[PDB]
Scaffold this motif. Structure first.
Motif, mmCIF file in Angstrom:
data_model
loop_
_atom_site.group_PDB
_atom_site.id
_atom_site.type_symbol
_atom_site.label_atom_id
_atom_site.label_comp_id
_atom_site.label_asym_id
_atom_site.label_seq_id
_atom_site.Cartn_x
_atom_site.Cartn_y
_atom_site.Cartn_z
ATOM 1 N N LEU A 640 0.844 -1.288 0.013
ATOM 2 C CA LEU A 640 0.097 0.061 0.094
ATOM 3 C C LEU A 640 0.747 1.136 0.096
ATOM 4 O O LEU A 640 0.652 2.229 -0.379
ATOM 5 C CB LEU A 640 -1.034 0.114 1.443
ATOM 6 C CG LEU A 640 -1.863 1.219 1.267
ATOM 7 C CD1 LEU A 640 -2.514 1.477 0.088
ATOM 8 C CD2 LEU A 640 -2.715 1.048 2.681
ATOM 9 N N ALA A 641 1.980 1.277 0.840
ATOM 10 C CA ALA A 641 2.866 2.268 0.621
ATOM 11 C C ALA A 641 3.506 2.663 -0.513
ATOM 12 O O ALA A 641 3.334 3.895 -1.128
ATOM 13 C CB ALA A 641 3.937 2.050 1.784
ATOM 14 N N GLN A 642 4.194 1.569 -1.308
ATOM 15 C CA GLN A 642 4.728 1.966 -2.443
ATOM 16 C C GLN A 642 3.562 2.235 -3.561
ATOM 17 O O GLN A 642 4.057 3.246 -4.283
ATOM 18 C CB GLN A 642 5.403 0.472 -3.083
ATOM 19 C CG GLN A 642 6.127 0.605 -4.383
ATOM 20 C CD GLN A 642 7.492 1.622 -3.924
ATOM 21 O OE1 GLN A 642 7.932 1.558 -3.079
ATOM 22 N NE2 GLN A 642 7.663 2.426 -5.153
ATOM 23 N N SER A 643 2.497 1.848 -3.545
ATOM 24 C CA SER A 643 1.256 2.214 -4.491
ATOM 25 C C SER A 643 1.287 3.680 -4.353
ATOM 26 O O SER A 643 1.440 4.394 -5.409
ATOM 27 C CB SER A 643 0.167 1.587 -4.389
ATOM 28 O OG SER A 643 -0.384 1.742 -3.069
ATOM 29 N N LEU A 644 0.889 4.247 -3.335
ATOM 30 C CA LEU A 644 0.604 5.734 -2.919
ATOM 31 C C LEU A 644 1.888 6.514 -3.631
ATOM 32 O O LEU A 644 1.509 7.496 -4.238
ATOM 33 C CB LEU A 644 0.374 5.976 -1.491
ATOM 34 C CG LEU A 644 -1.090 5.764 -0.753
ATOM 35 C CD1 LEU A 644 -1.007 6.068 0.583
ATOM 36 C CD2 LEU A 644 -1.675 7.096 -1.472
ATOM 37 N N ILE A 645 2.911 6.040 -3.474
ATOM 38 C CA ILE A 645 4.089 6.881 -4.060
ATOM 39 C C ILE A 645 3.968 6.863 -5.508
ATOM 40 O O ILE A 645 4.120 7.885 -6.189
ATOM 41 C CB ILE A 645 5.503 5.995 -3.383
ATOM 42 C CG1 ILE A 645 5.756 6.439 -1.888
ATOM 43 C CG2 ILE A 645 6.682 6.568 -4.558
ATOM 44 C CD1 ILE A 645 6.565 5.671 -1.314
ATOM 45 N N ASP A 646 3.864 5.571 -6.054
ATOM 46 C CA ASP A 646 3.796 5.370 -7.521
ATOM 47 C C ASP A 646 2.848 6.532 -8.176
ATOM 48 O O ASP A 646 3.229 6.977 -8.897
ATOM 49 C CB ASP A 646 3.436 4.063 -7.784
ATOM 50 C CG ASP A 646 4.477 2.875 -7.501
ATOM 51 O OD1 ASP A 646 5.363 3.230 -6.705
ATOM 52 O OD2 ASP A 646 4.325 1.890 -7.919
ATOM 53 N N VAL A 647 1.803 6.635 -7.624
ATOM 54 C CA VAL A 647 0.610 7.496 -7.990
ATOM 55 C C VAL A 647 1.331 9.040 -8.275
ATOM 56 O O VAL A 647 1.404 9.443 -9.101
ATOM 57 C CB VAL A 647 -0.606 7.769 -7.364
ATOM 58 C CG1 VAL A 647 -1.448 8.466 -8.113
ATOM 59 C CG2 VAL A 647 -0.946 5.859 -7.097
ATOM 60 N N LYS A 648 1.972 9.382 -7.172
ATOM 61 C CA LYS A 648 2.568 10.782 -6.894
ATOM 62 C C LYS A 648 3.827 10.959 -7.893
ATOM 63 O O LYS A 648 3.925 11.654 -8.254
ATOM 64 C CB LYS A 648 2.900 11.118 -5.526
ATOM 65 C CG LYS A 648 1.790 12.119 -4.697
ATOM 66 C CD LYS A 648 2.320 13.594 -5.153
ATOM 67 C CE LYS A 648 1.205 14.454 -4.395
ATOM 68 N NZ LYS A 648 1.633 15.900 -4.367
ATOM 69 N N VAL A 649 4.415 9.804 -7.807
ATOM 70 C CA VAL A 649 5.585 9.505 -8.882
ATOM 71 C C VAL A 649 5.093 9.685 -10.195
ATOM 72 O O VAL A 649 6.070 9.963 -11.088
ATOM 73 C CB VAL A 649 6.519 8.381 -8.472
ATOM 74 C CG1 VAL A 649 7.617 8.441 -9.328
ATOM 75 C CG2 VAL A 649 7.144 8.922 -6.851
ATOM 76 N N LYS A 650 3.912 9.182 -10.206
ATOM 77 C CA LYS A 650 3.368 8.992 -12.022
ATOM 78 C C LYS A 650 2.822 10.265 -12.190
ATOM 79 O O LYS A 650 2.913 10.653 -13.332
ATOM 80 C CB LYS A 650 2.482 8.009 -11.804
ATOM 81 C CG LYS A 650 2.661 6.505 -11.731
ATOM 82 C CD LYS A 650 1.447 5.606 -11.887
ATOM 83 C CE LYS A 650 1.938 4.033 -11.712
ATOM 84 N NZ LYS A 650 0.719 3.175 -11.316
ATOM 85 N N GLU A 651 2.567 11.062 -11.177
ATOM 86 C CA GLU A 651 1.802 12.492 -11.669
ATOM 87 C C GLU A 651 2.822 13.340 -11.930
ATOM 88 O O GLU A 651 3.232 14.002 -12.773
ATOM 89 C CB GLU A 651 0.743 12.709 -10.337
ATOM 90 C CG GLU A 651 -0.294 13.696 -10.678
ATOM 91 C CD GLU A 651 -1.165 14.122 -9.698
ATOM 92 O OE1 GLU A 651 -0.978 13.627 -8.737
ATOM 93 O OE2 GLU A 651 -2.063 14.740 -9.890
ATOM 94 N N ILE A 652 3.596 13.820 -10.392
ATOM 95 C CA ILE A 652 4.704 14.821 -10.242
ATOM 96 C C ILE A 652 5.884 14.408 -9.865
ATOM 97 O O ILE A 652 5.921 13.984 -8.541
ATOM 98 C CB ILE A 652 4.159 16.127 -9.735
ATOM 99 C CG1 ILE A 652 3.048 16.657 -10.338
ATOM 100 C CG2 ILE A 652 5.316 17.064 -9.427
ATOM 101 C CD1 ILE A 652 1.951 16.414 -9.800
ATOM 102 N N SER A 653 7.160 13.780 -10.371
ATOM 103 C CA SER A 653 7.159 14.011 -12.007
ATOM 104 C C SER A 653 7.138 12.507 -12.404
ATOM 105 O O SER A 653 7.651 11.628 -11.925
ATOM 106 C CB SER A 653 8.518 14.584 -12.237
ATOM 107 O OG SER A 653 9.553 13.859 -11.808
#
Ligand SMILES: OC[C@H]1O[C@H](O[C@H]2[C@H](O)[C@@H](O)[C@@H](O[C@H]3[C@H](O)[C@@H](O)[C@@H](O[C@H]4[C@H](O)[C@@H](O)[C@@H](O)O[C@@H]4CO)O[C@@H]3CO)O[C@@H]2CO)[C@H](O)[C@@H](O)[C@@H]1O
Length: 661
Positions: A640-653
């Motif tokens: 769950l932790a990694q997923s949340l990051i991925d999104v934000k890393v998918k978004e910016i940047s």
């Protein structure tokens, strides 16, 4: 005739309604187009395990539930998975008789118990008690008749008397049977049997009497009474005889206590008609329509099916039968039961003929009952040879499976093959060749140490006690250990060239001892391994001397026991396990060694616990410091932790998200 993925073969005992059952088969053939061939061979229950495995048994076996516990542990029986709805059509207690380790192993059909059968014309006042039978015999004998004739050759028929004054097979307590608490040699068993033997000696019965003569004798009007089950009623009606069915006589004011059998239907695990068999039993045989046909041939007794049982209950004879059952005890289904019956059978014959005293007969029976009960130790030579046969990678893979929380036999898999690791049930008795998961880790490890090194296989039991830190620097670590001075002992003038003694000298002195204790059994194991490509260890300073324990065997393996100083090495790690467990319990605000120790002695060794001390002083803190006490992140957190990051890393940047670390 033959097992084929279409045809059905059924086995049932010859005293049961096999002709009526065959009628059901004919009905089955009519509706679906499936022939059913009914056979009733003699001794079907002994031959079956011999044919079950060789492709030549029946698809379906009918017998009382007692043999079936033994069949299931050996994996001979297919698992039963009836609808929830179906269980409710049959009485729950019948499922209990056919329940083993929480698993269904057959379908129950009918409940059988012995009753007293008496001729109402010859004997309108049947005796209440056994002990009056003797006085009664004198008058009747004076008119060409006898009181009682029944099959003494099967202990089933004599057991109710034997059980009368307290005899039991295995004691039932806290929801289960104690397989080491056998009551065949108790005060109660000795009393009851003695009474029967005197009846013979006084020429009231003849020891040379079996089932067929007695039925005939009763049926001929020669004997006033017999002891038999519901199956016998059909032939008696044919003989033109007025008979009654009542409770068994009492003995010493205690009820007679018959063993109650539940007629059961098992499915052969190797059958290609498993689906068909299930369909046959539930929808055709285990029906009102189906059971009457069987019952019409020879009565089954009190059937498991509630809908049909409501009808039978009207028969006064079955009421008496069930009366005897409730006064008695439901047979065990445990595997050791067969051992029990064999023992009592010989004992009855031996005592009945006066070839031995009763005390001795039942004493011997006692010994024989525990013969199977007691836990045999392993014949590793038979285990190694069985493992060596299999290719090397298949075995190694299995070890990683034992440690993945798998959860009777667990199966491992242009020719196919099947590897079998047998889990031990609390009821079953250890075999001399039964490979337990623990014994499995033992054998393989002792055989393939260097191959374990390549895969670096450290279990979650060894990984936590810091096994890696000791493994990598092992080669250099061990020589320090060997070069070190063993001050305490021996007397220091013994080296081969430092002025002071060395620990190497100790392992030497030790090896000489082991060389003397080295059993032919062990030697035999060591050489067979080599020829099979299982190159082995010869010293503690070997590249894979420590990798023998990576797999966390319960015992010091049998292929390394006499190579000093490995036998004592074992306890080193085993203790560390006790050490951590007591460290953690201490951390909170609020046995392994002992076990390991016990097991090695089972192999015939006295652990020089001094060597263990030495191993500690050298590698104590190192092993202790590098323990993995602290816990770690939960899978939910990480994922769950990694997923949340991925999104934000998918978004910016939008860049590759790197993991959590
Ligand atoms: O020792 C030589 C004899 O060995 C063989 O008979 C054995 C069986 O293999 C054992 O299973 C056991 O038999 C029990 C049986 O398990 C038990 O169900 C009960 O059998 C009843 C049956 O429930 C009932 O439905 C009806 O059919 O009567 C049977 C009894 O005759 O009781 C049996 C024990 O009496 O122990 C016997 C040996 O005692 C082999 O079949 C024999 O031919 C052989 O002589």
């Amino acid at each position: 005739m033959k097992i084929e993925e279409g045809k059905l073969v059924i086995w049932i005992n010859g005293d049961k309604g096999y002709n009526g059952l065959a009628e059901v088969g004919k009905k089955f053939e009519k509706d679906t187009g499936i022939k059913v061939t009914v056979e009733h061979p003699d001794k079907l229950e002994e031959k079956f395990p011999q044919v079950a495995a060789t492709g030549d048994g029946p698809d379906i076996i009918f017998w009382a539930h007692d043999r079936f516990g033994g069949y299931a542990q050996s994996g001979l029986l297919a698992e039963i998975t009836p609808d929830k709805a179906f269980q409710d059509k049959l009485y729950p207690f019948t499922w209990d008789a056919v329940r083993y380790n929480g698993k269904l192993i057959a379908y129950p059909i009918a409940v059988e118990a012995l009753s007293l059968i008496y001729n109402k014309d010859l004997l309108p006042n049947p005796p209440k008690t056994w002990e009056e039978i003797p006085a009664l015999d004198k008058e009747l004998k004076a008119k060409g008749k006898s009181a009682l004739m029944f099959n003494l050759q099967e202990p089933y028929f004599t057991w109710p008397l034997i059980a009368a004054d307290g005899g039991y097979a295995f004691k039932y307590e806290n929801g289960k049977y104690d397989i080491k608490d056998v009551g065949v040699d108790n005060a109660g068993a000795k009393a009851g049997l003695t009474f029967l033997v005197d009846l013979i000696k006084n020429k009231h019965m003849n020891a040379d009497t079996d089932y067929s003569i007695a039925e005939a004798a009763f049926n001929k009007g020669e004997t006033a009474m017999t002891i038999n089950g519901p199956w016998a009623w059909s032939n008696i009606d044919t003989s033109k005889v007025n008979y009654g069915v009542t409770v068994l006589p009492t003995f010493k004011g205690q009820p007679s206590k018959p063993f109650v059998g539940v007629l059961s239907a098992g499915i052969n695990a190797a059958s290609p008609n498993k689906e068909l068999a299930k369909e046959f039993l539930e929808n055709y045989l285990l029906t009102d329509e189906g059971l009457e046909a069987v019952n019409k041939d020879k009565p089954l007794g009190a059937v498991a099916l509630k809908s049909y049982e409501e009808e039978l209950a009207k028969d006064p004879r079955i009421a008496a039968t069930m009366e005897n059952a409730q006064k008695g005890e439901i047979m065990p289904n445990i595997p050791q039961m067969s051992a029990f019956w064999y023992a009592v059978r010989t004992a009855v014959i031996n005592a009945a003929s006066g070839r031995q005293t009763v005390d001795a007969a039942l004493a011997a029976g006692s010994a024989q009952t525990n013969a199977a009960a007691t836990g045999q130790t392993a014949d590793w030579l038979s285990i190694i040879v069985y493992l060596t046969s299999f290719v090397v990678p298949i075995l190694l893979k299995a070890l990683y499976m034992l440690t993945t929380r798998g959860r009777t036999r667990i199966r491992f898999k242009r020719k196919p093959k099947h590897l079998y690791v047998s889990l031990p049930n609390a009821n079953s008795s250890m075999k001399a060749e039964e490979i337990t998961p623990g014994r499995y880790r033992t054998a393989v490890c002792g055989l393939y140490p260097a191959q374990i090194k390549a895969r670096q296989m450290i279990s979650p039991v060894m990984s936590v006690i810091g096994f890696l830190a000791l493994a990598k620097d092992w080669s250099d670590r061990i020589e320090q250990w060997l070069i070190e001075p063993c001050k305490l002992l021996p007397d220091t003038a013994a080296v081969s060239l430092g002025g002071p003694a060395t620990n190497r000298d100790y392992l030497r002195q030790r090896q000489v001892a082991l060389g003397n204790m080295e059993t032919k059994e062990s030697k035999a194991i060591r050489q067979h391994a080599e020829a099979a490509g299982c190159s082995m260890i010869e010293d503690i300073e070997s590249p894979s001397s420590i990798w023998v324990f990576a797999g966390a065997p319960d015992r010091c393996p049998p292929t390394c026991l006499f190579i000093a100083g490995i036998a004592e090495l074992g306890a080193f790690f085993s203790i560390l396990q006790d050490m951590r467990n007591t460290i953690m319990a201490s951390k909170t605000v609020g046995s392994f060694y002992q076990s390991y120790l016990r097991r090695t002695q089972s192999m015939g060794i006295q652990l020089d616990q001094r060597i263990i001390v030495l191993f500690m002083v050298a590698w104590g803190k190192e092993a202790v410091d590098n323990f993995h006490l602290g816990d770690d992140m939960d899978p939910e957190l990480r994922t769950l932790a990694q997923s949340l990051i991925d999104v934000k890393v998918k978004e910016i940047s939008n860049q590759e998200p790197l993991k959590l670390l």
